[PDB]
């Protein structure tokens, strides 16, 4: 028995894994239809920053040899036109360096070999010509997403681990599977958006939270855990750059739980150890970015060794209010110190764009960049209809259930005044992650979109619900406490097998015909090394099919191109129009691509660019918008009050396409 | 001088209740802690109650939580202790000693460097 | 939570020897040990705090010390006025537990 229940847990992890990799997979292919598709309609598929993710990928690919094709992208010329820019570490390209490191290799044995791997017929249309789908191992699209979704399909994997050790039975990592199963709609999206890149870095950060949690939980250090907790740190940090953010979050829960004398002294020497080696790495192989130093995970990592270290002067020290009010003070002040001592010291002014879009949500300070970023619906507060969902499904009532036992055991086995430092207090990963669902769920109430680092973390507290320590002891008997959790287990299927029809009971359409038309007219009527500018949604589908060079691109943030964008957008202005004639003319572009509806005013007001650029451009107020300039050119088809402009592209009133002259 | 001072005691019928006072001279009140100890007739030292009255917090030995309460006013710089429901195992000397407060407690309270006179009470039906 | 035992229940001895009083805990409290003199009838008196910091004003016969949880109380030229119930005390947490105690009589 000592033997088959570790079997059994580690069969079980697996199966579930596999399980949710075939889940994400059929639900990908009713959604988009990849099977029918021709190789340039799957391009299409991929929308705004996807696009600009999978270019590279392809770039790599098609390139002669490896090493060419990842020198042509360190040192790429097109993505932003007028610079050489380095896009490994301003785009975190590295998911597509090893998935085209293998892929070459692969492809060219199988070539050699005779086997058929890639299989495909001509697949017609209709009206439009008659294209040729691919399908098999061999095809770029199913390499790249049988990588992305074999990765996040060790999510549920890592979750039903979590719950057992959490738990310390089976049946509390049935319960986090199946809180998992049952809200997979409201936790992830990578059944949409393969190439986003959280798709990448969130089945390492999980699996970071799941060796951390039994290191704290066994007492664990050596040199052994040190390269357990690295080989997970560091492929999250070279992905996702937000990944740092959520280390930095999972640092306030250890200290948290170091100050409350629940881990030992050795097992934080490791813990700490391990994240000074991962930063160090990540640094080196992100070619020393600037804005890795200046973030909050090197000073956090910083302040906490200072605390662990100066630990063992403090043992004399028995009021434990005093002892957790100084550990505190030193880290927040080392934290804020180290922070300021470098982003307004040394000269590294890390970009203030995350605070700029927090001090929008509760001040009235608009700024063009905020607006552009609010109005997204997807950094705005955590709508009532989520809640409401993850109510029905009895996640939050479970959870915080589970939450007010681990309080009150916790309150009522603790001397909370004095504190002893000769011994630990045990249930130290409890605490650990009961705090890190707490900095889960407020990051998920402010920004929507981060309830994928709050859902998991539910699922993971409320599988806590089957600890026989809490919620009991000796005395509920075995015969009891198991019939009460297959009652609760019946009554999860009752909520949630409704919740399982009704996403896999959703099909999306078949495109449109616009985008591929208007392409087709930029590859026969435009020059190979013409420059476009444009919204930032269509410049990354341009750029990924046309391999035109462009001005703007969606992931914006980094400097030398937030800039760009204002320049681009003042097309939408009122500004005259000589003003952006020059504008465009010195950014060096020939095109700008934009869409009828771009310009179509009312939804919801300080939403629309009209509203914008009439709270940062007052002087210019009153003046006639350049919008309804370019909509009477359209309608009229005559170049007689837009001066330099030409309306060149204009088919079905959808996608206008101007020249400069 | 320093010194504190125990009044209030006498005897009272079991199950009664009775309110005893220590009155502290010199040393200002709610900048230092206050204790009250029991010495039951041939036993040994026991701890019974804590105040610190500067911020008011209060400190029970198990076996009075429930039946005591210690309340100190710095108005007349004195401390009260009421018990209520006496048992018969609650007749001993009382004593008052001074200790430093909680909120600078920082490696544990301060011996007891100034004790009473002890105040008697005796719970006999 | 935390219990003082001392062991000596009971010693006996005269003037000039050397006498020891040992006190254990549990717990670790690191050195926030006091200990008292009671003569019958009185209130206690403080001798020792911290384990080996003697008391103003106390004479300075007696000593104190600390090894591990254990510690002890050293009285070297013992007088006829040391004569008295001596006490242990801890107060590294809340219930503040004192010593079973030691009675030191007159040998003969």
């Known amino acids: 028995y000592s033997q088959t229940w570790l079997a059994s847990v580690v069969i079980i992890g697996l199966l579930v894994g596999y399980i949710n990799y075939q889940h994400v997979y059929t639900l990908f292919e009713n959604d988009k239809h990849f099977s029918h598709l021709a190789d340039f309609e799957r391009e299409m598929a991929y929308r705004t920053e996807m696009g600009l993710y999978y270019s590279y990928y392809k770039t790599i690919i098609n390139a002669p040899s490896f090493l060419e094709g990842v020198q042509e992208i360190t040192h790429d010329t097109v993505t932003e036109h007028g610079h050489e820019i380095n896009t490994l570490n301003r785009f975190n390209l590295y998911p597509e360096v090893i998935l085209a490191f293998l892929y070459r290799p692969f492809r060219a044995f199988a070539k050699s070999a005779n086997w058929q791997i890639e299989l495909c017929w001509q697949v017609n249309r209709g009206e439009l010509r008659p294209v040729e789908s691919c399908e098999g191992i061999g095809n770029p699209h199913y390499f790249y997403i049988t990588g992305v979704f074999i990765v996040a399909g060790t999510v549920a994997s890592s979750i039903f681990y979590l719950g057992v050790l959490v738990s310390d039975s089976i049946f509390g990592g049935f319960l986090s599977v199946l809180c998992f199963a049952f809200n997979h709609g409201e936790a992830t999206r990578v059944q949409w958006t393969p190439p986003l890149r959280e798709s990448f870095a969130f089945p390492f950060i999980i699996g970071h939270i799941a060796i951390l949690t039994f290191v704290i939980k066994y007492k664990k250090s050596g040199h052994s855990m040190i390269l357990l907790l690295t080989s997970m740190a560091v492929p999250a940090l070279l992905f996702w750059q937000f990944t740092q953010f959520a280390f930095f979050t999972q640092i306030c829960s250890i200290f948290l739980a170091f100050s409350l004398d629940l881990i030992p002294f050795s097992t934080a020497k490791t813990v700490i150890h391990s994240h000074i080696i991962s930063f160090l790495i990540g640094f080196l192989l992100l070619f020393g970015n600037e804005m890795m130093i200046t973030a909050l995970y090197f000073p956090s990592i910083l302040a906490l060794g200072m605390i662990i270290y100066i630990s063992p002067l403090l043992s004399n020290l028995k009021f434990r209010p005093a002892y957790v009010l100084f550990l505190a003070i030193i880290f927040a002040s080392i934290t804020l110190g180290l922070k300021i001592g470098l982003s307004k010291g040394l000269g590294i002014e890390d970009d203030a764009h995350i605070f700029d879009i927090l001090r929008s949500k509760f001040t009235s300070f608009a700024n063009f960049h905020t607006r552009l970023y609010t109005c997204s619906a997807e950094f705005d507060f955590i709508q009532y209809s989520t809640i409401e969902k993850l109510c029905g499904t009895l996640l939050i009532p479970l959870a915080l259930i589970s939450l007010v036992t681990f309080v009150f055991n916790f309150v009522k086995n603790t001397n909370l005044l004095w504190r002893n430092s000769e011994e630990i207090g045990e249930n130290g990963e409890i605490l650990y992650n009961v705090v890190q669902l707490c900095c889960s769920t407020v990051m998920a109430f402010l920004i929507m979109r981060l309830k994928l680092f709050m859902t998991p973390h539910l699922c993971i507290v409320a599988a806590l619900f089957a600890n026989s320590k809490l919620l009991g002891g000796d005395r509920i008997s075995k015969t009891i406490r198991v019939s009460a959790l297959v009652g609760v287990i019946a009554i999860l299927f009752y909520r949630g097998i409704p919740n399982i029809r009704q996403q896999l009971n959703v099909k999306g359409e078949y495109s449109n015909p616009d985008q591929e038309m208007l392409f087709d007219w930029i590859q026969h009527n435009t020059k190979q090394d013409a420059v476009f500018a444009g919204t930032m949604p269509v410049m990354a589908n341009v750029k990924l099919t046309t391999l035109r060079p462009i001005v703007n691109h969606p992931h914006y943030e980094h400097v030398g191109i937030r800039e760009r964008t204002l320049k681009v957008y003042s097309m939408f202005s009122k500004k005259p129009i000589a003003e952006v004639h020059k504008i465009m003319k010195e950014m060096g572009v020939n095109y700008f691509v934009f869409q009828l509806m771009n310009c179509s005013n009312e939804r919801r007001p300080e939403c629309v660019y009209r509203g914008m650029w009439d709270e940062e451009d007052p002087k210019n107020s009153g003046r006639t918008a350049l919008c309804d300039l370019w909509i009477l050119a359209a309608n009229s088809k005559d170049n007689s009050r837009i001066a330099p402009f030409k309306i060149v592209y204009n088919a079905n009133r959808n996608y206008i396409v101007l020249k400069i002259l | 001088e320093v010194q504190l001072v125990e009044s209030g005691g006498g005897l009272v019928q079991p199950g009664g209740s009775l309110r005893l006072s220590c009155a502290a001279s010199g040393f200002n009140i709610s900048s230092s802690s206050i204790h009250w100890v029991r010495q039951a007739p041939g036993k040994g030292l026991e701890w019974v109650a804590s105040?610190?009255?500067?911020?008011?917090?209060?400190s029970y030995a198990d076996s009075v939580k429930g039946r005591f309460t210690i309340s100190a006013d710095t108005s007349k710089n004195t401390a009260y202790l009421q018990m209520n429901s006496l048992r018969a195992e609650d007749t001993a000397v009382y004593y008052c000693?001074?200790?430093?407060?909680?909120?600078?407690?920082?490696?544990?309270?301060?011996?007891?460097?100034?004790w009473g006179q002890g105040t008697l009470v005796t719970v006999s039906s | 939570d935390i219990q003082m035992t001392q062991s000596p229940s009971s010693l006996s001895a005269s003037v000039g020897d050397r006498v020891t009083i040992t006190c254990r805990a549990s717990?670790?409290?690191?050195?926030?040990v006091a200990w008292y003199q009671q003569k019958p009838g009185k209130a206690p008196k403080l001798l020792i705090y911290s384990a080996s910091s003697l008391y103003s004003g106390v004479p300075s016969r007696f000593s104190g010390s600390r090894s591990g949880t254990d510690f002890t109380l050293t009285i070297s030229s013992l007088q006829p006025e040391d004569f008295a119930t001596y006490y242990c005390?801890?107060?590294?947490?809340?219930?503040?537990?004192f010593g079973q105690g030691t009675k030191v009589e007159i040998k003969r």
């Open positions: 717990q670790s409290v690191s050195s926030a």
């Open positions: 005390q801890q107060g590294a947490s809340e219930p503040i537990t």
């Open positions: 000693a001074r200790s430093s407060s909680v909120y600078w407690s920082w490696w544990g309270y301060s011996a007891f460097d100034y």
């Open positions: 105040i610190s009255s500067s911020y008011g917090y209060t």
